[PDB]
Amino acid sequence: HNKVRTCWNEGRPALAGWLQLPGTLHAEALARLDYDAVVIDMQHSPIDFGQVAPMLIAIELGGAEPFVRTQVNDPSDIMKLLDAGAYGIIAPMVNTRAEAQTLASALHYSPRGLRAFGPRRPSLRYGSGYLAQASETVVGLAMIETREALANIDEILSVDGIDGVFIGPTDLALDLGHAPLVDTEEAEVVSAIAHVRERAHAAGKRVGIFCGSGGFARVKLAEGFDFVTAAPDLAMLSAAARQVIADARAL
Amino acid sequence: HNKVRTCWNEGRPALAGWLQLPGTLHAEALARLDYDAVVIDMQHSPIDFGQVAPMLIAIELGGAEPFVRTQVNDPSDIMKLLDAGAYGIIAPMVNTRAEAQTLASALHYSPRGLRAFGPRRPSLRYGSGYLAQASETVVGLAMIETREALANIDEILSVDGIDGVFIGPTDLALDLGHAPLVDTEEAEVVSAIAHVRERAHAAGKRVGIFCGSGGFARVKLAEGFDFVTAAPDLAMLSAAARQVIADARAL
Amino acid sequence: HNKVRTCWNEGRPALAGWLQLPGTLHAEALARLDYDAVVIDMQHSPIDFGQVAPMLIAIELGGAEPFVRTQVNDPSDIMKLLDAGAYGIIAPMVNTRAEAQTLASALHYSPRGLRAFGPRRPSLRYGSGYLAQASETVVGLAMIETREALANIDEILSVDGIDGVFIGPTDLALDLGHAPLVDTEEAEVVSAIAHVRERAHAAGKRVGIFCGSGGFARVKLAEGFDFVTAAPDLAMLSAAARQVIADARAL
Amino acid sequence: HNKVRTCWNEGRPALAGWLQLPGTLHAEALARLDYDAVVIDMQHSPIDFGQVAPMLIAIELGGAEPFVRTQVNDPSDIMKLLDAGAYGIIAPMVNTRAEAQTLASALHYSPRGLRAFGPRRPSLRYGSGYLAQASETVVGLAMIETREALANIDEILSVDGIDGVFIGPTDLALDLGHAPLVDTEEAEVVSAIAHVRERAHAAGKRVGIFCGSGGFARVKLAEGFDFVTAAPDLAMLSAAARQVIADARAL
Amino acid sequence: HNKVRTCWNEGRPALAGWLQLPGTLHAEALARLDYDAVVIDMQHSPIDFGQVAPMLIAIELGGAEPFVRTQVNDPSDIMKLLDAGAYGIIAPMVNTRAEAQTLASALHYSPRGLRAFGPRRPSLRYGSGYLAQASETVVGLAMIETREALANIDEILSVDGIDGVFIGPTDLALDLGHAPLVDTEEAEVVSAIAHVRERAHAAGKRVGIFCGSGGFARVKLAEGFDFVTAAPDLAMLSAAARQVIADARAL
Amino acid sequence: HNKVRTCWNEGRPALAGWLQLPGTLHAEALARLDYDAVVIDMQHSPIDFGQVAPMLIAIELGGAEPFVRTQVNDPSDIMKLLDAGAYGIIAPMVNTRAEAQTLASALHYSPRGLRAFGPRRPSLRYGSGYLAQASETVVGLAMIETREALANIDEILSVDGIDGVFIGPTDLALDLGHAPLVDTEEAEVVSAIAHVRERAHAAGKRVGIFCGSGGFARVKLAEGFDFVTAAPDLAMLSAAARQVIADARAL
Ligand SMILES: [Mg+2]
Ligand SMILES: [Mg+2]
Ligand SMILES: [Mg+2]
């Protein structure tokens, strides 16, 4: 079973890890914490395909669903990640219904999409009866990061093969001419985020959001977000190190 | 100049980072914080020589001294790390004066040691005037983590080519038949640590210590330790993630 | 000389290896067996560009032509593989004449295509007179894996710069609403495969096919297929290991 | 639980995989077959520490015990592999009781050995209750592949911290001035192998053996060997490929 | 400050290194020579994303601007390189105003482009006030390598978000039906190169050029080219080795 | 055949490449030049075992003998390099007859040495008739770079399983209390080098030498040295780049 789809099917949200550092050790350790999934960022990180492959194995062993935020919404890139046992896909900068159809096409075998058949690691997980439940094993979220995406939210949500949307708040803030701050209080950005959540739920589709703090994630969970990521390993490591230095130097 | 030797020459201690995760991004980010050095652990980590090499470049760029805790006190292993721009060496499990001489021999060119000549990255850092100050550019600490090392402390300190010692408290606790707790305060281990510190200062040599928390490091700095490491990137990242999950799932 | 083009020019087919495992050791060992080429799969494998590069060197040394089944029909991806000494290109999911023109454009220098000039490893193989015979050194096959590709077979074969087609039977079976089994007996799939072979030969172009067994490859060779791949290293290794376990446990 | 120690505690032998190819995909696939352990060869392979680390994760996920045949009986090499989640250690060329004590010392924490404390991946597997069962979680076998080792068999078996011995027949044949044939049945080598097995069982210690075929492994299991490895991934892949080519090129 | 933009703002050209070999050692050594930038070639090289990442760190430490000649003009590929601290982008085979707009869009944050926000290594270099000067920190050159690009030079130069053009002479020679020789004397190619330079300067935009020799670079600098690359590490290493062999064998 | 042993058996010396940069491209290109061997330096370089493995494949394909200067004279390190197709071994810092016996033991199968059997890549090169000529296929040189080694030269040369010695002049200069200059001509060092050469030839054993220039190599070849290395790839690349910059920035 997909542990994020299990959470949803039991009427409960998913809390996810977010990794911008390559390596299997921190991936496994965070996966063993009370996270339902761990997302590997391949957009804003030095993580190439060579480095994601063993991190997906580490997350699965830790007992969380391996998710990937891809570099770009490219069909063949996403297919190769699925065949390496990425059981969740978050595609950045999905601005139109066609781009959302491009995402959906890659996540599903024919007749439902055009996904190429060679499921190396999924066939090892789910066995010979993988084809019949292949779509159920994978989670697909289109990212809302632009005024265009926000304007096209209704038509993006109408695409069948995506489970719903994942808001990128910093990029959404920036495109609306505001500060690209994580967990922004900016009234227009908060209003847009709330609007995207309501339309998603109105369409019978899931809504997720990127968070930079535990306190902000708690509010988003209380607001009824289905998928909540908190926080980037680098940001948490940087903050903890600064705090350790402060305590050590009596600052 | 060696920023740890600069700290010492201005009669003040060095605060160091400690890395068990491979990769250049967190190495650079931590190096840019108020650390004087960053130690890469090659004993209790998945970091091979292939992975340490670019991490040393990242630490130097961040503006901290690249240090390495080696797998073992092996002359040729240490020489290859120096030639890749490791400007500090912490050798584990140094139990005798001969093992401490084995360490010293690797850190210095002839006549002072038997270090092989090919300083690829040090010649790029220090230029044509590297040979004249080569010993000054490198810091060498023998690890005390056994009853044998503790018994042989005076003869270890008498070796000319080491700057002094680096206590491993958890391993020292374990060898004395106590619980290997991070920041252990078992009276026998505290007594041994205090003894090692006083003999080091009595011998006109530096003393350092591994810490798993900022609070413990502050005490060790206040106790007059010259080199204090706090804390492992993995431990800080794991603790921060647990705290972020706790805050997110809180009522 | 291109050993697959040598086979064809002597009126004889090519038997090829198929690799989904990264590493140079098995690549060399299989290359030294009675294979004319060895295909590296970059679609349904964990093999990134970093890992293909030395595998191409290993195959060439073993005395087989390095072939690559790419992730996708992308011009620049294919050009970079040619410049790393991939002397055969199999492009997946080529469904139209335009996509087949996209393939051809990447395999040929101007005026014949738009291939960028910097032939790092081919210039080392073929020397200063490489430009004059550059097209002859490379083999290009468009993959037929869809009802669209099957319907457009005539217009795909009419493209000048491709040597012909390579059938992907599992994907072709799946898109026709049948089981994605290697070496399928499904009458409609067998009929389509036979149809694609006849049109290819009628057009004076080569036809190849993916096989999962030696027995099936023998039939395809007897059917007059020019390029026959048998079998995936993973599938052969998995089957052999199961058989070794069975013999060991007296099953 | 250690699945090899589970086999032994239920009075029955362990069948193990043997890997000379680097990569996580074949490691996982073989681990999912009816093997109790999978040994990664770091002596007679291109597998460095960088490449073994993620292979140990893949084997554990597949549901077999990660074992390692090390390059050499080096304490610090073995400790670093344990801390990366190698739960079995086969040390080559153990010829004396002192070399066997050198092995034992590395596999156990103080008081029983001198193993350095930092169990990164074992603490993630076994949790907070790891230290209490740490020795139980690890399996240690000294390799017998010399006339010296064969002569010193009784004194090697008398060492407390090793579970027993692992025979290398080809190297044992070669050192006795015979042909280094896989699954050798040279009467002198068979006599020595039989002698080593009886002395091991007489000493209340385990005996294992390297096999290059399923048929030979079945005999060794029937001869009462506790740990049987069959066969090297490369050898099985090479043999299968030769057979597939033979069937394809047959009349 | 961007050291190439510093050169330009002081009314002076930039001399750049050009690297087709992966690794950090030669990158640092060349960066410490009298080069203003060092370009890493990702088109005509075995250098994947995994291998560029630490080379960018090495170049920055050496005290030259990290530049990248990308595989292709792909928005998301370029964004990921910027976020890994590539502070110059040379995009190959830019033939139209739209392709040049595609380049510009990737180099600038909203409203000026559509660059995704997550500046991992640039935020570490330039700090919290990076957003305000983000565009000034990056240099963007569209490559002129085709008759199409040459014909569209005016419309390419009119695009706001590119600093100007970088001529690829070998590809330009080849597309004009001449020999693909570095530093060609071919009158038509020299005429076209001179024409492209004049139109660039007439448009108030920068012009750069690839050179295979120091003598040719001196002429291009004297001709008023703003960005001059000389020469490929492989070509310089190959020539030097041939000369060393000649001197050694008395040839 | 071993191309260095072929040179010697035809009563003539061997010219060798020397590589401190990792990667397969420059290794192949230099191997295709008029070098008999190419030595990979694993002592004074960032090249780990992971990176040497594919470089040995590249050198063999180029048509030169893959040699390795190891980190240290360690039996098991040398055996693993032989099994990865290193057909020449230069062991640093061999100071005694016992250390030279330690080298010899690793290069030969029983009865002649104690080399462990698993010749992965040599069995692929030389086929089924490898064992009969295994010692003939490998070249072994003990390095003389200390006053101890120089004093023990006669007893080092008396060891049967080494082909002879390889002088490290810079390290020999340094140990004798002189400047470690490339191609040093300090009278004491020249005297020692001359002494080592005459004793080697008197003992019916080969003598080799490290050179940093083609001119110096020509003299050493004229002095009757059997194996001459010239020059390090880094040194040649750095010198060529400096010269290209000088010519470019010239008036
Ligand atoms: Mg975003
Ligand atoms: Mg297919
Ligand atoms: Mg070009």
mmCIF file with all atom_site columns, C-alpha atoms in Angstrom, chain B residues 20 41-49 51 69 71-72 93 145 170-171 174-177 179-181 234, chain D residues 48-51 53 74 76-80 83-84 109-111 113-120 124 131:
data_model
loop_
_atom_site.group_PDB
_atom_site.id
_atom_site.type_symbol
_atom_site.label_atom_id
_atom_site.label_alt_id
_atom_site.label_comp_id
_atom_site.label_asym_id
_atom_site.label_entity_id
_atom_site.label_seq_id
_atom_site.pdbx_PDB_ins_code
_atom_site.Cartn_x
_atom_site.Cartn_y
_atom_site.Cartn_z
_atom_site.occupancy
_atom_site.B_iso_or_equiv
_atom_site.pdbx_formal_charge
_atom_site.auth_seq_id
_atom_site.auth_comp_id
_atom_site.auth_asym_id
_atom_site.auth_atom_id
_atom_site.pdbx_PDB_model_num
ATOM 1  C CA . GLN B 1 20  ? 28.886 12.382 9.416  1.00 0.00 ? 20  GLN B CA 1
ATOM 2  C CA . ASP B 1 41  ? 34.243 12.016 10.353 1.00 0.00 ? 41  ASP B CA 1
ATOM 3  C CA . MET B 1 42  ? 35.632 9.129  8.159  1.00 0.00 ? 42  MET B CA 1
ATOM 4  C CA . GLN B 1 43  ? 35.327 6.496  11.024 1.00 0.00 ? 43  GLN B CA 1
ATOM 5  C CA . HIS B 1 44  ? 31.586 6.504  12.051 1.00 0.00 ? 44  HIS B CA 1
ATOM 6  C CA . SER B 1 45  ? 30.067 7.662  8.683  1.00 0.00 ? 45  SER B CA 1
ATOM 7  C CA . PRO B 1 46  ? 29.404 6.463  5.075  1.00 0.00 ? 46  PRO B CA 1
ATOM 8  C CA . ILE B 1 47  ? 32.062 9.041  3.831  1.00 0.00 ? 47  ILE B CA 1
ATOM 9  C CA . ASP B 1 48  ? 34.829 7.377  1.684  1.00 0.00 ? 48  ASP B CA 1
ATOM 10 C CA . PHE B 1 49  ? 37.859 9.297  0.235  1.00 0.00 ? 49  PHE B CA 1
ATOM 11 C CA . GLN B 1 51  ? 33.268 11.928 -0.985 1.00 0.00 ? 51  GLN B CA 1
ATOM 12 C CA . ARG B 1 69  ? 38.727 12.432 11.946 1.00 0.00 ? 69  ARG B CA 1
ATOM 13 C CA . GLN B 1 71  ? 39.109 5.847  10.019 1.00 0.00 ? 71  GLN B CA 1
ATOM 14 C CA . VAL B 1 72  ? 42.457 4.780  11.670 1.00 0.00 ? 72  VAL B CA 1
ATOM 15 C CA . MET B 1 93  ? 42.483 4.995  19.034 1.00 0.00 ? 93  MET B CA 1
ATOM 16 C CA . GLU B 1 145 ? 39.445 6.865  24.058 1.00 0.00 ? 145 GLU B CA 1
ATOM 17 C CA . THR B 1 170 ? 31.607 7.821  24.698 1.00 0.00 ? 170 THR B CA 1
ATOM 18 C CA . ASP B 1 171 ? 34.385 5.341  23.635 1.00 0.00 ? 171 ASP B CA 1
ATOM 19 C CA . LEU B 1 174 ? 32.617 2.164  27.045 1.00 0.00 ? 174 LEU B CA 1
ATOM 20 C CA . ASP B 1 175 ? 36.295 0.970  27.521 1.00 0.00 ? 175 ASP B CA 1
ATOM 21 C CA . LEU B 1 176 ? 35.921 1.768  31.322 1.00 0.00 ? 176 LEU B CA 1
ATOM 22 C CA . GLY B 1 177 ? 32.779 -0.541 31.424 1.00 0.00 ? 177 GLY B CA 1
ATOM 23 C CA . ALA B 1 179 ? 27.188 3.309  29.280 1.00 0.00 ? 179 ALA B CA 1
ATOM 24 C CA . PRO B 1 180 ? 28.392 5.002  26.004 1.00 0.00 ? 180 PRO B CA 1
ATOM 25 C CA . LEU B 1 181 ? 26.064 8.058  26.515 1.00 0.00 ? 181 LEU B CA 1
ATOM 26 C CA . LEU B 1 234 ? 23.072 13.975 11.665 1.00 0.00 ? 234 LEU B CA 1
ATOM 27 C CA . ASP D 1 48  ? 34.851 0.278  -3.046 1.00 0.00 ? 48  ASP D CA 1
ATOM 28 C CA . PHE D 1 49  ? 33.266 1.515  0.259  1.00 0.00 ? 49  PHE D CA 1
ATOM 29 C CA . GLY D 1 50  ? 31.321 4.262  -1.670 1.00 0.00 ? 50  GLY D CA 1
ATOM 30 C CA . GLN D 1 51  ? 29.522 1.495  -3.674 1.00 0.00 ? 51  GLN D CA 1
ATOM 31 C CA . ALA D 1 53  ? 27.121 1.444  1.462  1.00 0.00 ? 53  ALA D CA 1
ATOM 32 C CA . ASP D 1 74  ? 41.687 -4.849 9.143  1.00 0.00 ? 74  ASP D CA 1
ATOM 33 C CA . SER D 1 76  ? 38.935 -0.233 11.328 1.00 0.00 ? 76  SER D CA 1
ATOM 34 C CA . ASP D 1 77  ? 37.701 -1.366 7.806  1.00 0.00 ? 77  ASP D CA 1
ATOM 35 C CA . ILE D 1 78  ? 35.357 -3.950 9.496  1.00 0.00 ? 78  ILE D CA 1
ATOM 36 C CA . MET D 1 79  ? 34.103 -1.389 12.155 1.00 0.00 ? 79  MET D CA 1
ATOM 37 C CA . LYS D 1 80  ? 33.141 1.161  9.390  1.00 0.00 ? 80  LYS D CA 1
ATOM 38 C CA . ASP D 1 83  ? 28.352 1.104  11.289 1.00 0.00 ? 83  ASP D CA 1
ATOM 39 C CA . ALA D 1 84  ? 27.032 1.130  7.623  1.00 0.00 ? 84  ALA D CA 1
ATOM 40 C CA . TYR D 1 109 ? 32.205 -3.611 22.035 1.00 0.00 ? 109 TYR D CA 1
ATOM 41 C CA . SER D 1 110 ? 34.258 -3.439 25.315 1.00 0.00 ? 110 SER D CA 1
ATOM 42 C CA . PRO D 1 111 ? 34.664 -5.509 27.472 1.00 0.00 ? 111 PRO D CA 1
ATOM 43 C CA . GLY D 1 113 ? 36.427 -6.447 22.028 1.00 0.00 ? 113 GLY D CA 1
ATOM 44 C CA . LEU D 1 114 ? 37.686 -2.868 21.217 1.00 0.00 ? 114 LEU D CA 1
ATOM 45 C CA . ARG D 1 115 ? 34.994 -1.877 18.577 1.00 0.00 ? 115 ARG D CA 1
ATOM 46 C CA . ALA D 1 116 ? 34.692 1.977  18.334 1.00 0.00 ? 116 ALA D CA 1
ATOM 47 C CA . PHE D 1 117 ? 31.162 3.338  19.166 1.00 0.00 ? 117 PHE D CA 1
ATOM 48 C CA . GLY D 1 118 ? 29.117 5.147  16.472 1.00 0.00 ? 118 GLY D CA 1
ATOM 49 C CA . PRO D 1 119 ? 26.499 2.637  15.180 1.00 0.00 ? 119 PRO D CA 1
ATOM 50 C CA . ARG D 1 120 ? 24.807 4.941  12.580 1.00 0.00 ? 120 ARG D CA 1
ATOM 51 C CA . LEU D 1 124 ? 18.283 2.894  13.154 1.00 0.00 ? 124 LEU D CA 1
ATOM 52 C CA . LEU D 1 131 ? 23.780 -2.133 22.746 1.00 0.00 ? 131 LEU D CA 1
#
